[PDB]
Structure formats: structure tokens, C-alpha cells
Amino acid sequence: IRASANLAATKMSECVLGQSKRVDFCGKGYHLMSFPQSAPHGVVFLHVT
Amino acid sequence: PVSMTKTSVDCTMYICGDSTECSNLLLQYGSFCTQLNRALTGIAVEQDKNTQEVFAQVKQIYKTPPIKDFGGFNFSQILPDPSKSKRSFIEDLLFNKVTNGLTVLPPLLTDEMIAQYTSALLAGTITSGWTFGAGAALQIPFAMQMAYRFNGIGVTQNVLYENQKLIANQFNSAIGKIQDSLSSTASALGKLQDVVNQNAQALNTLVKQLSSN
């Protein structure tokens, strides 16, 4: 869970709070942005690519 | 996944629930309890540390202004709904697809609290661009942000505005599709369901063992 959580944080950290340039890190495509959504015990992203 | 269910277990009840003749035999095992109970406790705080460092990446809690003139981009599904938990629509589905000394500590950051983060992290993302990660969030009209965000993959801003209405419509129709996909198959949330399930299984298996000779 923790590694995913740190992976989750990095996804908010880099992909929400900015625009990532890591190909296939914010979903398939040249990334645009992402909107986190709360969820039980986890989190859902809406990677807009 | 982000966090687990902050399970805590008392060895003494689990292993000798209300039996003086038993707990005396448990003391002969020295410190196995105190470390086990310490181990799970260390897990418990880690989960709260998980949720803090995942969501609370933002100092100030932003809220969206009464006007939604997002360059045509329609976010009404992702913003929290003021008339309900001040949670959003798309997430509302998401909470709907999910389901002896053994206690469950509650999470420090409550669900209503969790939403405000996800409202804020979403709010500065919308109105301020990326600048709200670096420091003071700076209001920027949303159609400007895509011109940056398109500038972030090697397509100059002239793509966006010369195609502003469609791209907004494309994203808008895009947003609705997740609503159907989430509503249609419960397997859309397979991973989180697993996070619940093995946790459910672990406890049940832990509970059943009490029946073994």
C-alpha cells in the first residue's frame, strides 16, 4: 500500500500539481492534467490525456 | 489504494480473553504481545501518514467561486455538490460501488475532511494552474491554462483556442463517460475492492482460527 501511496502522492505531486512529462505515467498519452477524486481507502484519478 | 483499515488487536483478549489462568501462561512468552501490538500500531499511524501525504499536499484550503465560466469546460460533475457531505457526483458513485479484542480504529482524516482536500486540490488546479504547488496560488483563467498545458506536450497554444469549443465539448462528453463506466461495471473499482477483500479475508481467517484445536 505504501509504495502505491507514495506512487499516489507522486501522481498528485507531479501530475495534478503540475504537468508530468513521464510517458505512460499519467495514462496513455501526452499528459494534460488530472483531477483526484476521493474514494474509500484509496484514490481515483481522472487522467486527461 | 491509499490506506488500509486501521486494525488493532489486543493479544491478551485474543489469546486469553478473560482468563486469569490463561494470561499467566501468556506472560511466560515474554514480549511477543507488546511487539505485535506495537507492530500494528506502527501500521496504524503509517496509514494516517499515507492519507496526509497523499491528500494534504496543499496548505490553504481553496474553494471555488460562484461562477463556473470555465472556458466552456464543464466540471459540474467533479466539483463538490453544495446541496448534499460536500462531495462530488462522480465520487458519490465511487463510495456506492464499494463494500474478540479486534477493534477498528477510525481514520484521523474523516470522509468529509477527505472531500475538502479533494475539493481544494481540485480548486487550485482549476483556477490557478500548477502554481499552487509551488507557493501562493495565482488565479489564471482556465482557457489560459490549457494553452500552457498544450505547451507542455509540444503543441503550441494556437491549437486550443482555434479549437476551444470542441475541445471543451470533447472533455465534457469525456467526463460523462466515466460516469457510465463507473455506474455500469462494479469491476471498475477492482483494486480498492481487493484492498477491502483481503483485509476482510485476513480478519475472517484470523477470527476462524479461534475454532481450531
Place this chain on the structure above:
Amino acid sequence: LIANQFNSAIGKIQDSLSSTASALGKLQDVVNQNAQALNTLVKQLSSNFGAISSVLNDILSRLDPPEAEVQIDRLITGRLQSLQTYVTQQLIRAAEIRASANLAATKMSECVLGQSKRVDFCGKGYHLMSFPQSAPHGVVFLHVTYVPAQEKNFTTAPAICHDGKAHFPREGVFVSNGTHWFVTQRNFYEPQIITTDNTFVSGNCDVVIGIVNNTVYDPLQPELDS
């Protein structure tokens, strides 16, 4: 000033580290955790585990082998199982550390050896650089991060018309000081006279949302006229 700004910045870390040792919790716990694991591992030696006593040398001086074998076996299965517990803890804990080590290496790889572009990877903000520093059983980085400070509203529009055609900014966004329109970079204000040398062509005024009528200066015409 930026030089001095950095100079005074560094001295602050000297005080914060000197003032409180709580800043180094993330290392101290690691020493603490292992010390706890060892102390628990050491203390287990005193547990009788159901044996008549917790001293091997006693049991050997206390019982003949055919009966001592039973009692010693009770310690062995217990004490081994405690040692087994400790090792499993270390493997898991060592994985956590090794997870940080790889993260530490990457930060050293991407934040020392170069300027990382991952937002909130080298501290809050548009990262500049980092200075790795030794430490017991760990590492400490002194990230140098650009954080905007003093801010001013301005009125924006994604373009301007000069002749009925559309201009966007090659680098910057369009602003006005209320009477005159300026185009400026994105994270530290400096207005500029909007000339063709900063702007590029794309379309006309009938499709852009927000474009405003304006005058773009051409450096070429004065040279030809003069």
C-alpha cells in the same frame, strides 16, 4: 540580492538544525527502531517460555540430559521463533530503507546531478538545486527552491488583434497596467512592448475567445522610414 538571499537562507538551516534535534526524526527513528528491535531481541533471553528457568547454564547444571533435553527444547523453539520474528522484521524494514535508498539515489541522481522537473520532488516549488550532506545511517539534502513572493493582479486575454488578425505570445501571457497592454513571462513580472519580434501569427479575430484590439509595434518600419 539573490546571492545574499541564498547566503542568509543557508544560515537559517544552521539555526533550525542547531536549535532542535526534532528536525532529524526520520533518521533518529531508524536508529531508535533498530535499537528497539535489538533490545526486544536481547530481552527475550530472560523469558522462561515454559521452561523451568531461562538460563541454559542452570538447566545444564540442574538436570541430567534425558530430562534437560525437554526443557532446553522449550527455549530453542521459542527463542529461535523470536529470532525468526526479528529477522522477518528486519527484512521488511530493510526493504523500507532500501526503498528510501533508491529514492535517495534518484534524488541524488536527479536533484544533485541535475535540476529535477518533478513538482514537489526537490521540495516545495520550482526546484533549483540540492546540496547532499552526510548523516549517520542516512542522508540530508539542502534543496534550493524558487517560491514566488510578491504578486499583482493584471487583466489578461489570450491574444490581440493588430490588423484584424490574431497574435499569441511566443513566451509569456498578455497583461495590461490598465491603460497599456503588456506581455510577460509567467513566474516573475516584467512587462514588454508587444512587438512582432515576441509574437506569432495564428488565425484572425473571429474565433478567439477573449482577444482584444491592440497595437503591435514593428521595429522594421522606422528603419525603412528613417
Place this chain on the structure above:
Amino acid sequence: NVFQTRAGCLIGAEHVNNSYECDIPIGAGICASYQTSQSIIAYTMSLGAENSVAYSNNSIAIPTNFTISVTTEIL
């Protein structure tokens, strides 16, 4: 002098309307701290000074001065 919260029955702490940063975590969003004459308070932990952003079709907020800061990240 008893406060009831979702996590349990907290005794010894005055319940407080004002929200402040979390010093000690209790559960269900309630945090305790020692403040002024002084005593132990428990409160709904403040998620911080709330904010809001002057969103518009037609304005930008571009900083005129910055900082060079240094923080410590420890691993």
C-alpha cells in the same frame, strides 16, 4: 468537563469552537493541544486558513518578487 467524539469519550479536555492546526491527533478529525491560564483543549482540527481564488475570464496574478528558500528533506 467531558467531550464526546466519534472515536470515544475524551475526558480532561475542554471542547473548543475555534479551529487550530493539529498538534496531537485523536481520531475523527479531533485534535488536542495545550494552550492558554493554560489547559488542554480539543477541537475540530483546522484544515488551515481557508482561502478562495478570484477566478475570472479576464485576469492573471503574476508575482513581482520571489524568494530563494532552502528546506531540509531527510531520508
